Amino acid sequence: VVADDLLKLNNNLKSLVGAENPKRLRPALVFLVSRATAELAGLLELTTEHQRLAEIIEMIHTASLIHDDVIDDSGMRRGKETIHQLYGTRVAVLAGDFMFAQSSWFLANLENIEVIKLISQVIKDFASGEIKQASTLFDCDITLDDYLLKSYYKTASLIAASTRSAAIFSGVSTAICEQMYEYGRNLGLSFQVVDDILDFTQSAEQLGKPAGSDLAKGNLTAPVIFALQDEPQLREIIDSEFSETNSLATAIELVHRSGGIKRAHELAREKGEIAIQSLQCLPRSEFRSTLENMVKYNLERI
C-alpha cells in the first residue's frame, strides 16, 4: 500500500530530524544529504522536492522488491490460476505498478528533468539486470568487476541516484552533486559487499543445511569470487551445483579457509573509504558526521 508506505517514511523522517535536532536506510540517506546540501545552498528548510524525493526513493525500492519476488510459473500446463491465488500474484503486480506509477507521477510534478532521467535509468538497469540474474547463477567465470556492476544495478545505483538527486534539488554545484553521487554509489557497494559477506559467514556458522544461502543457489559474491582464484576444487564443486552429498559444506569450508572473506572485507573497506572521501567537499556538520558514521557502522557489522 502506497498510503502505508508514505506514512511510515514521514514518521521515520520525523524521528530523524528530531534526533539530529539536539527500510529506513534509503530515506535517511536522502534526508541527510538533503540537509547537508540544503545548508550549503542557503536554504532555510527542506524543500517539498526533498521530502517527496525520500518517499519516491522508498516507493521505488519497495515496488522493485515486490515485483522481483513474483513467482515463475513458466513450465506449468494447469494449476496456474491456483498458484497465483495462493501467492497473491495479481496483488503483487498491481501494488508494484501503482507504487512505481505514483513515484513517477510525484517525480514529474517535482519538474526536475535531470532527476527523472537518472531515476528512470536506475529502474531500466534494475529490471534488465534482474531478468538476466538466473542466467548468471553458478557461473564461476564471473569477474569481480562483473560482480560490482551487478551489485550496482541491483542495489547501489538507486542509492547513488538518491543522494545525487538530493543535492540536485538543493541547487548545489554540479561538482558537489557528482560527489554526492559518488558517496551513494560507494556506500551502496560497500553495503552490498557486507551483506554478501554476512550471508556467507552466517551460512558457515548455522546448524542446518545452508540451502537458502547465496552460494547454495549459485549467486557467487565477493568472498567466493576471491576464493575461486585459489581454489580449483571450489570451482569444480560449484559447477556441479553441489550434486554430491554434503559438497555444499565442503565448498563453504574451502571459501572459509581461502583468503576470500578477508579480501572481500577489504573490498568493502576501500569502497567505504571512497564514500567517506566523497563527503569532504561538505563542511563540518552533524549531517556529514552521520553520513560518515553510516559507512563506519556498515563496516562494523564485519
Place of cell 561538505: 282
Residue closer to its own copies (CB basis): 4 or 111: 111
Asked if residue 80 belongs to a known ligand binding site, the reply is: no
CB of 111: closest distance to its own copies in angstroms? 5
118 binding ligand A1L38? (CB under 6 A): no
Residue in this structure with the C-alpha cell 558537489, named with its chain if needed: 176
CA distances (Å), origin 199, targets 69, 98, 177: 19, 32, 33
Is 192 in a helix, a strand, or coil?
helix
Q: How far is CA 121 from each of CA 111, 124, 125, 143, rounded to the nearest angstrom?
A: 17, 5, 6, 24
Window 10-29: contact mask with its own copies (x via CB under 8 A)? --------x-xx--------
List helix spans (H) across 21-136: 25-41, 48-68, 80-87, 89-110, 113-136
Which member of 27, 96, 188, 210 binds its own copies (CB under 8 A)? 96
Least distance between ligand A1L38 and beta carbon 33 (Å)? 19
- Is residue 65 close enough to count as binding its own copies by CB under 8 A? no
Least distance from ligand A1L38 to the Cβ atom of residue 12, Å: 21
**Given its phi and psi angles, is residue 208 left (phi above 0), alpha (psi -120 to 50 degrees) or beta?**
beta
The correct pick among 42, 44, 45, 72 for binding its own copies (CB under 8 A) is 72
84 contributes a contact to its own copies by CB under 8 A: yes
Interatomic CA distance for residues 162 and 172, integer angstroms? 15
The answer to whether 97 contacts ligand A1L38 (rule: CB under 6 A) is yes
- Residue 120 sits in the site that holds ligand A1L38 (CB under 6 A): yes
State the DSSP code for 283. Answer: P
Residue 73 binds what, of its own copies, ligand A1L38, none (CB under 5 to 8 Å, by partner type)? its own copies
Is residue 216 near its own copies by the rule CB under 8 A?
no
What per-residue string of b and e applies to 75-89 under the rule 16 or more CB within 10 Å gives b? eeeeeeeeebeeeeb
242 near its own copies, rule: CB under 8 A: no
- The binding site for an all-trans-polyprenyl diphosphate consists of 77, 154-155, 192, 209
- The binding site consists of 23, 26, 61, 68, 72, 77-78, 154-155, 192, 209
